[PDB]
Amino acid sequence: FGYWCSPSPEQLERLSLKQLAAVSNFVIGRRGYGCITFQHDVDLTAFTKSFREELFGKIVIFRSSKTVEVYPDEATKPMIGHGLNVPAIITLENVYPVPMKDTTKFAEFQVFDRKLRSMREMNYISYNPFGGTWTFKVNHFE
Structure with a gap:
């Protein structure tokens, strides 16, 4: 629904579980809403089911209220420095x-x-x- 990321979902599919634990240059946005550019390597191993279905509007939500949330379910939220x-x-x-x-x-x-x-x-x-x-910087999404 306007959601996109880089590396793209189909590219993330080529990575081993070890590589997936440290994805460099990860960017995720929603056209018309905004974008998140990660400053460190990210661990996407939790989303191997379907990068597209897990990330786009579930784990990362860009809303019409002009906000963005990452891990809106507190059960899915890893510690600071992880995921x-x-x-x-x-x-x-x-x-x-x-x-x-x-x-x-x-x-x-x-x-x-x-x-x-x-x-x-x-x-x-x-x-x-x-x-x-x-545009602003966050240290994490706790």
């Missing part, structure tokens, strides 16, 4: 002040932007009011 529970850079699209998409009210965007910048757990990287594109 996908590792540092990542995230871009979310169409993120706007309250839903106030009017760029002519620039002062209001500046208030919102300062709120984004003050976030403790979603460490600000950038925010572009023309499109509502918010």
